[PDB]
Amino acid sequence: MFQQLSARLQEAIGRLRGRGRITEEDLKATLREIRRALMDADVNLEVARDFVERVREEALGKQVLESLTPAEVILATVYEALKEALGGEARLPVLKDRNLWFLVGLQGSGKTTTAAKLALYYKGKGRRPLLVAADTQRPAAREQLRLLGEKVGVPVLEVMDGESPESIRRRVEEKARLEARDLILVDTAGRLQIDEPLMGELARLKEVLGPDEVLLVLDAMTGQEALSVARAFDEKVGVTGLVLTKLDGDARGGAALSARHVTGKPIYFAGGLEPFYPERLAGRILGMG
Numbered sequence: 345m346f347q348q349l350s351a352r353l354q355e356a357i358g359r360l361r362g363r364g365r366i367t368e369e370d371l372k373a374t375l376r377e378i379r380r381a382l383m384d385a386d387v388n389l390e391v392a393r394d395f396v397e398r399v400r401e402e403a404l405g406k407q408v409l410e411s412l413t414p415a416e417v418i419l420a421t422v423y424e425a426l427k428e429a430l431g432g433e434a435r436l437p438v439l440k441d442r443n444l445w446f447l448v449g450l451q452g453s454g455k456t457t458t459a460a461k462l463a464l465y466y467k468g469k470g471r472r473p474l475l476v477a478a479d480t481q482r483p484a485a486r487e488q489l490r491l492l493g494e495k496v497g498v499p500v501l502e503v504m505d506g507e508s509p510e511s512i513r514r515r516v517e518e519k520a521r522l523e524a525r526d527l528i529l530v531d532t533a534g535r536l537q538i539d540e541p542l543m544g545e546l547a548r549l550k551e552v553l554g555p556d557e558v559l560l561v562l563d564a565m566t567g568q569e570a571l572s573v574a575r576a577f578d579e580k581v582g583v584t585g586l587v588l589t590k591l592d593g594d595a596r597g598g599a600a601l602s603a604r605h606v607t608g609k610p611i612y613f614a615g616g617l618e619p620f621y622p623e624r625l626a627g628r629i630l631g632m633g
């Protein structure tokens with residue numbers, strides 16, 4: 345995962361291998377190399393700085409300068425720091441008896457596909473999901489979700505053009521009652537960029553529907569821009585967790601590695617969609633697969 349970063353971290357660590365004890369300047373050099381590798385992978389500057397300080401403190405705590413196999417001590421330390429940067433421990437949203445979640449994000453994030461994949465994931469766990477195609481301006485966005493629902497075997501309520509949030513609420517409620525739906529996944533409007541009309545409509549929909557989770561879907565390939573998108577969605581709408589898509593196309597990793605620090609939000613899922621496992625990703629970056 346994250347090809348360029350992975351190669352650079354592995355090389356930085358491997359440079360230390362089979363050479364016996366290393367010097368302080370050797371360690372500092374290695375840290376500077378890791379820092380540059382993170383920077384080049386579009387990790388947020390402060391995240392990268394904190395990461396290497398963490399590694400250094402942890403490595404020195406493990407007596408790296410006395411070690412006869414310092415590369416292994418570095419490897420361990422970097423693994424942990426990666427784990428932590430990525431979220432520490434696997435996290436998922438809390439289901440209750442009934443749940444109504446928003447998916448938010450830019451057109452291009454994979455939001456709509458993600459909504460359908462999440463519905464399938466939770467159907468496999470025994471929930472009874474309902475997809476809601478909530479774009480009140482674009483019939484094609486609603487049709488997209490309708491087709492995906494048919495593919496995954498999950499019902500889809502399509503909002504009407506210009507439908508009020510209150511009417512959406514009523515129709516969703518009705519359908520959920522008639523169909524015993526217990527997980528309502530609202531695919532909100534996707535647009536190419538953030539603007540005030542979008543935000544205001546999302547914020548209003550949120551006031552009226554009262555979602556228990558707001559999942560922000562981000563194309564990881566956008567790098568740091570994703571986290572600026574995240575901050576904007578959080579400030580203007582309010583997010584509870586992230587879904588990162590297109591991780592397999594991301595050679596860099598900066599968004600994943602920076603999200604916890606920058607946004608304070610968990611990465612729930614990774615995009616054909618699985619719960620996000622920070623430890624697995626940390627291993628993959630380091631070549632343990």
Ligand SMILES: [Mg+2]
Pocket residue numbers: 547551
């Ligand atoms: Mg308000």
